[PDB]
Amino acid sequence: STLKEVQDNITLHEQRLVTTRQKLKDAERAVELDPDDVNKSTLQSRRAAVSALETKLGELKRELADLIAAQ
């Protein structure tokens, strides 16, 4: 039930973190080789996407820890 729902959401977010981080790696490399404005903007966006996922994951994981402790 509730704990499993949170766990599945952590999985979905961990999977999205992997794919978003690959997109970030691609964007970082492009800027390393040619730091033009478009490449810097792509990088800025990919960074924010990864960081936002990591934030959400941290929230989910702290809440699951407390769900477990209460049970």
Side-chain angles (χ1 to χ4, degrees), residues 4 6 9 18 26 39 45 58 61-62:
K4 174 56 168 166
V6 177
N9 202 193
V18 168
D26 298 338
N39 286 343
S45 294
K61 289 173 178 182
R62 283 178 176 272

Side-chain angles (χ1 to χ4, degrees), residues 10 12 24 28 32 45 48 50 53-54 56 64-65 71:
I10 289 168
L12 178 60
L24 174 59
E28 290 171 330
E32 284 169 20
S45 294
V50 166
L53 281 164
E54 285 167 340
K56 177 68 183 191
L64 185 54
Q71 290 305 123

Side-chain angles (χ1 to χ4, degrees), residues 11 52 65:
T11 298

Side-chain angles (χ1 to χ4, degrees), residues 17-60:
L17 182 56
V18 168
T19 60
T20 309
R21 274 187 161 288
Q22 181 61 49
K23 294 168 177 267
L24 174 59
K25 291 178 191 187
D26 298 338
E28 290 171 330
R29 186 56 177 157
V31 166
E32 284 169 20
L33 294 175
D34 192 353
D36 71 9
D37 293 345
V38 170
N39 286 343
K40 290 186 80 176
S41 174
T42 302
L43 181 55
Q44 180 182 15
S45 294
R46 295 306 190 189
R47 284 175 172 179
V50 166
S51 288
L53 281 164
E54 285 167 340
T55 297
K56 177 68 183 191
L57 277 159
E59 297 168 19
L60 290 168

